[PDB]
Amino acid sequence: ALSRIKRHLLTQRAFKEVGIEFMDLYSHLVPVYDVEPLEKITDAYLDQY
Amino acid sequence: IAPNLSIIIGASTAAKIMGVAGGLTNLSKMPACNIMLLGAQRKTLSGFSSTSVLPHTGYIYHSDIVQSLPPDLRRKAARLVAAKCTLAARVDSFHESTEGKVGYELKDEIERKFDKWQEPPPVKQVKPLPAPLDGQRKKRGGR
Amino acid sequence: LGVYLTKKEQKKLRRQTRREAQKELQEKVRLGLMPPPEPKVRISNLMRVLGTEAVQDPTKVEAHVRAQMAKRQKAHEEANAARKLTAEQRKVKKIKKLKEDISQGVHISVYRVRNLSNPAKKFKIEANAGQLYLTGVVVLHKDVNVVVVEGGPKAQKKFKRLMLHRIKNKCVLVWEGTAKDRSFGEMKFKQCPTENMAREHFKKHGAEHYWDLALSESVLESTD
Amino acid sequence: DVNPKAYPLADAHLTKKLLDLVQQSCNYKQLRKGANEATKTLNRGISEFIVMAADAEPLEIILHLPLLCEDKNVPYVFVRSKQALGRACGVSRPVIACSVTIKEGSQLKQQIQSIQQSIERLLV
Amino acid sequence: EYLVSPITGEKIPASKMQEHMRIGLLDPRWLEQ
Amino acid sequence: NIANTLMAKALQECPNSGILWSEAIFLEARPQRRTKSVDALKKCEHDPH
Amino acid sequence: AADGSVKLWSLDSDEPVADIEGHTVRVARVMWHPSGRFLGTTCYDRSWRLWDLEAQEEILHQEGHSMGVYDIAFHQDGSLAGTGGLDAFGRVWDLRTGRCIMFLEGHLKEIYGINFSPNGYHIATGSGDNTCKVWDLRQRRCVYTIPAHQNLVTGVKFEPIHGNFLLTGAYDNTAKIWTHPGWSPLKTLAGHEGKVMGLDISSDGQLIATCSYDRTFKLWMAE
Amino acid sequence: KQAKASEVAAPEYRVIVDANNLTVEIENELNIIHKFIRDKYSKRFPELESLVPNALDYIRTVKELG
Amino acid sequence: VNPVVFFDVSIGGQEVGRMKIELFADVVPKTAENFRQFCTGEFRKDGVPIGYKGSTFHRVIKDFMIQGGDFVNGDGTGVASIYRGPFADENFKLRHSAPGLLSMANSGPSTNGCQFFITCSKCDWLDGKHVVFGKIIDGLLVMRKIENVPTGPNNKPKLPVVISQCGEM
Amino acid sequence: SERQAEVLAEFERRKRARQINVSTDDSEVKACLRALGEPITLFGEGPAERRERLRNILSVV
């Protein structure tokens, strides 16, 4: 997993389409973004680091 | 110099691709997958994604016919054109169909492929929701 | 000409034949010509298929399932053994007797070795000529071994690789070409200390040009 | 016959051996289909010979390969029907040009060489 | 020309050859479907 | 062109030649040196040349 | 050329002065007559045409071979001409009667190199079966067989003065200098990077130019 | 230039070929010029090479910057 | 040669045999093309082989005419052809003065549709009004049995006389 | 009885049908069907249906 994360950090520049939805709070529409799990793990590790 | 290849694509694009390739003979000896990479500057991503840069895009990708297609249909189109362009070179380098008969015989099929790719989707019937089930249906067992 | 087929077509043809056979068996069972298939039971499958009855008399159940397994195994074995006897048969007559299709052209390779005093190399060359069914002759002279081998193209390619790599004073092919018909008989050796006797033996079959080329090659090797 | 320009055209006997070798190379993954792949292999200097078909309406689309072969010292041969060549290559679609590639310690070596010799015996 | 069908073993011309293959292995359950 | 043909002939008949391969790089044009020649060349041998 | 057209060009003009047409098959060989007027053209149309300088017409379209005539070899006096086909057959036709005299049978592959001896009695025909048959015109039989190389012999020609030595060239990137009689080889001209397609000797016999398949011409002279 | 002005035995084919080789010759010499300009301007601005990948754009940029 | 068609007559559920009627494509190429499109059919209405298969004879005048082949309405008022509606007459050189000839039944000029009328006798008044689509080369006994079928009001047969199968022979 | 006999007869008839070669050329199939005496097209059937009909006719005869 760490090797894949490093490879994606070093080389990956193009990514898959991320979905968008909107939570309705009856005062504003909060965006919620759907990202692929493969990129999600890399982004989560990057955020933690 | 290259009547058929000038027929297939723009004259300016034809001149640019022969210039970068090194000659009519030099371009005719190149594989089709390489001609479309001619004049592909390594545009640096300025924080944007690689797709915004549009990499692996050559002078054929920026030609007149290729730029007249929707972006999702662009890259594929380029490849097709490149292949046919190669054929034109492989004819023009041997000085055949100087009137351009091979040029028309390739451009018409290029237009046909573009029409097929851009054709309206066919009529597809919707599946009615299956009726509720009752009784028993035999389902096998095993591993 | 025979035409091949892509792997996709091979897979589709095999799948269609297998499905045809399965449908055939199933509809044979439908019409009563065939008894319904029995479950295939092994040792692991025993307590799942015959669990309610193996407690009645386990040893009989073990015997029955082992009998079924042995029946399947022995059904597989009979055909294999019969067709392996078929292997012996052909290998000795239809799987090893080819002759390389030597009917319209005989490849003739004549080589000139410098030192061939060992009888083991001559015996190995005679065994390779008799096993590959390649005709020819061998002439011995003073630091001269003219070995001519006429036969098929695959036999000549095997003999050249055996004489150039599998046999060790140097061996070089003096004349490798094609001929209309055969000129030499069976693989035999002839010792000729004089060049006139070897030239007459080569001209008895019309192959004196090979002996002349070997003498010219020996003169060119002794000159330079 | 149909293609009088194909000077190095193989006879009926040679075509069978050629297609058998092409199929065997495809089994060993030693074959590259299509003119572009043949050109790529020739430029890489990994091919040994090229088997091309003499039936193609823009025939010159293959004519670049022989000259490049003379540049890279690689034998080339012509075949009658492109469909048969494609079937030998393992592709149902017609193929007009294919190349055979070198592998280290390949079992096909001798057969390759044999066919190579035939091509040199076919040239003039 | 004349070619032998690898699935049928009959002398068939090469002009229809590829087509002879396409409708040669056509699965009858496709007709059923 | 004859030089390239001879070079190609020399590479075909005398592989694993570091000096010949390095000089063949210099025969090859700049767009075709790094893309194809050097990779197969490094695969062939790791000579100091 | 391979298009079937014969181009008669001058020694100064870069353009061909005469364009002799009439052949659709690939013209294999074209050799002028020893008298200087006629010219025999052998193509792959299983025939051999004869042209002239003052006529420029088909003098004799002598067919007869089962395959295409590869090489033609006229006599030193011009009375006979030996045309060799691609079906291992060679017909020695008469230039004064119009009939074949000798059938040069015995070869296996197609005959590529054929040249009559300047003495007027011998004739050497080289085929692609790595052999070369030297026959006698007076004895009407094959005098000897010369396996000079192991490839297809495409060039076989003796000396134009007396014919004491014969240069045999094959596709094995080497030439052999044999001899008029026993044809014992004297010189092995190696060093060619490709197959020896054509070869020729000088009128004096001091330099031999042999072209190869590596697009180069190599001369061999006495040192 | 003379061949172009003629249409405005030395056939046009050799002129076309020599022009289509001149394009590669001038491209290579322009690559040499761009390399030299990069080497010189690395003292002034050692980062514009990565920022501006195109050679001609690099030359125009250093011309407008100095 | 002229295209030959075949139609199995089924009167009352009983097969009276097949009727081989060859269409004259020389004098009527449009009627022969319409008969070839209605015999088997490839795609007429949303990919369906609609034609003369399954139609019935709606008018049977004894020793006068046997008209039918209406696949739209079934009573003889249906008009359909390969030219997307009614088409004009091909030629007036063919006459209905011979029994067994099947002409394009219509209600007037340029109204020839899927309705075909086999003349059971020589009708001089039908010459020029309708063009003969073809002639029955075989199966005249089935046409004579269908023409002698009992017909009720407005020449409507009380027994179902339909075509079970139709195609090209 | 007759039921087993007839169903078995149809069984081997179908088995014979699966093992009969019919050309893929539509023109040759049309000519063969015309020679057999049957109409080429059965109520606008498809070419595959025509080939199947020819195969069954050959099986019966």
UniProtKB/Swiss-Prot annotation, chain C:
Q: Where in the cell is it found?
A: Nucleus; Nucleus speckle
What organism is this sequence from?
A: Homo sapiens (Human)
Which residues of the parent protein does this chain contain?
436 to 683 of 683
* Noted disease: Retinitis pigmentosa 18: A retinal dystrophy belonging to the group of pigmentary retinopathies. Retinitis pigmentosa is characterized by retinal pigment deposits visible on fundus examination and primary loss of rod photoreceptor cells followed by secondary loss of cone photoreceptors. Patients typically have night vision blindness and loss of midperipheral visual field. As their condition progresses, they lose their far peripheral visual field and eventually central vision as well.
Q: Lineage of this protein's species?
A: Eukaryota, Metazoa, Chordata, Craniata, Vertebrata
Q: What name appears for this protein in its UniProt entry?
A: U4/U6 small nuclear ribonucleoprotein Prp3
Protein origin, superkingdom: Eukaryota
Q: Where are the annotated segments for Mediates interaction with SART3? A: 1-115
The entry's function note states:
Plays a role in pre-mRNA splicing as component of the U4/U6-U5 tri-snRNP complex that is involved in spliceosome assembly, and as component of the precatalytic spliceosome (spliceosome B complex).
- PTMs? Ubiquitinated. Undergoes 'Lys-63'-linked polyubiquitination by PRPF19 and deubiquitination by USP4. 'Lys-63'-linked ubiquitination increases the affinity for PRPF8 and may regulate the assembly of the U4/U6-U5 tri-snRNP complex.
What does the entry state regarding organ or tissue expression?
Highly expressed in retina, liver, kidney and blood. Detected at lower levels in heart and brain.
Query: Source gene?
Result: PRPF3
Swiss-Prot record, chain D:
- Look up what happens after changing Y76A: Reduces U4 snRNA-binding by about 50%
Region of interest (Interaction with U4 snRNA and U4atac snRNA), residue spans: 32-44
InterPro entries associated with the record: eL8/uL1-like, H/ACA_rnp_Nhp2-like, Ribosomal_eL30-like_sf, Ribosomal_eL8-like_CS, Ribosomal_eL8/eL30/eS12/Gad45, Ribosomal_eL8/Nhp2
PANTHER family annotated for this entry? RIBOSOMAL PROTEIN L7AE FAMILY MEMBER
Similarity comment: family membership: Belongs to the eukaryotic ribosomal protein eL8 family.
- In this UniProt entry, the residues modified to N6-acetyllysine are K17
Q: Which GO terms describe its biological process?
A: box C/D snoRNP assembly; maturation of SSU-rRNA; mRNA splicing, via spliceosome; ribosomal small subunit biogenesis; single fertilization
Q: In which tissues is this gene expressed?
A: Ubiquitous.
> In this chain's numbering, which residues are marked as the site (Interaction with U4 snRNA and U4atac snRNA)?
E57, K82
Check the record and name the Pfam families matching this protein. Ribosomal_L7Ae
> What is a single cellular component term in the Gene Ontology annotation?
small-subunit processome
Tell me if S-adenosyl-L-methionine is a UniProt keyword of this record.
Answer: no
Q: Which UniProt keywords apply?
A: Acetylation, mRNA processing, mRNA splicing, Nucleus, Phosphoprotein, Ribonucleoprotein, RNA-binding, Spliceosome
What name does the UniProt record give this protein? Answer: NHP2-like protein 1
Purpose: Part of the small subunit (SSU) processome, first precursor of the small eukaryotic ribosomal subunit. During the assembly of the SSU processome in the nucleolus, many ribosome biogenesis factors, an RNA chaperone and ribosomal proteins associate with the nascent pre-rRNA and work in concert to generate RNA folding, modifications, rearrangements and cleavage as well as targeted degradation of pre-ribosomal RNA by the RNA exosome. Involved in pre-mRNA splicing as component of the spliceosome. Binds to the 5'-stem-loop of U4 snRNA and thereby contributes to spliceosome assembly.
**Residues bearing Phosphoserine?**
S118
Q: Where is this region: Important for U4 snRNA-binding?
A: 92-124
Mutagenesis / variant outcome for changing A53F: Abolishes U4 snRNA-binding
Matching CDD domains: SNU13
Predominantly, its location class is: nucleus
Swiss-Prot record, chain H:
How does the record describe the protein's post-translational processing? Phosphorylated by PRP4K during spliceosome assembly.
Residue runs in coiled coils: 9-43
The entry's localization annotation reads: Nucleus; Nucleus speckle; Nucleus, Cajal body
What tissues has this protein been observed in? Ubiquitously expressed.
Disorder noted: Retinitis pigmentosa 11: A retinal dystrophy belonging to the group of pigmentary retinopathies. Retinitis pigmentosa is characterized by retinal pigment deposits visible on fundus examination and primary loss of rod photoreceptor cells followed by secondary loss of cone photoreceptors. Patients typically have night vision blindness and loss of midperipheral visual field. As their condition progresses, they lose their far peripheral visual field and eventually central vision as well.
Instruction: Please describe what this protein does.
Output: Involved in pre-mRNA splicing as component of the spliceosome. Required for the assembly of the U4/U5/U6 tri-snRNP complex, one of the building blocks of the spliceosome.
- Domain notes per entry: Interacts with the snRNP via the Nop domain. The coiled coil domain is formed by two non-contiguous helices.
Q: Which family does it belong to?
A: Belongs to the PRP31 family.
Return the protein name. Answer: U4/U6 small nuclear ribonucleoprotein Prp31
Q: Which organism is it from?
A: Homo sapiens
Q: Which gene encodes it?
A: PRPF31
Swiss-Prot record, chain I:
Q: Name one GO molecular function term.
A: ribonucleoprotein complex binding
Q: Which organism is it from?
A: Homo sapiens
Q: What does this protein do?
A: PPIase that catalyzes the cis-trans isomerization of proline imidic peptide bonds in oligopeptides and may therefore assist protein folding. Participates in pre-mRNA splicing. May play a role in the assembly of the U4/U5/U6 tri-snRNP complex, one of the building blocks of the spliceosome. May act as a chaperone.
Keywords attached to this Swiss-Prot or TrEMBL record, sorted alphabetically, are: Acetylation, Chaperone, Cytoplasm, Isomerase, mRNA processing, mRNA splicing, Nucleus, Rotamase, Spliceosome
A matching Pfam family: Pro_isomerase
Q: Which family does it belong to?
A: Belongs to the cyclophilin-type PPIase family. PPIase H subfamily.
The record's listing under InterPro entries reads: Cyclophilin-like_dom_sf, Cyclophilin-type_PPIase, Cyclophilin-type_PPIase_CS, Cyclophilin-type_PPIase_dom
Biological process GO annotation list? Answer: mRNA splicing, via spliceosome; positive regulation of viral genome replication; protein folding; protein-containing complex assembly
The record's subcellular locations are: Nucleus speckle; Cytoplasm
| Catalytic EC class | isomerase
- Put simply, this protein is called Peptidyl-prolyl cis-trans isomerase H
Activity regulation, in the record's words, is: Inhibited by cyclosporin A.
Its Gene Ontology cellular component terms are: cytoplasm; cytosol; intracellular membrane-bounded organelle; nuclear speck; nucleoplasm; spliceosomal complex; U4/U6 snRNP; U4/U6 x U5 tri-snRNP complex
Reactions catalysed, semicolon-separated, are: [protein]-peptidylproline (omega=180) = [protein]-peptidylproline (omega=0)
Primary location group: nucleus
Every PPIase cyclophilin-type domain range = 6-168
Enzyme Commission number(s) of this protein: 5.2.1.8
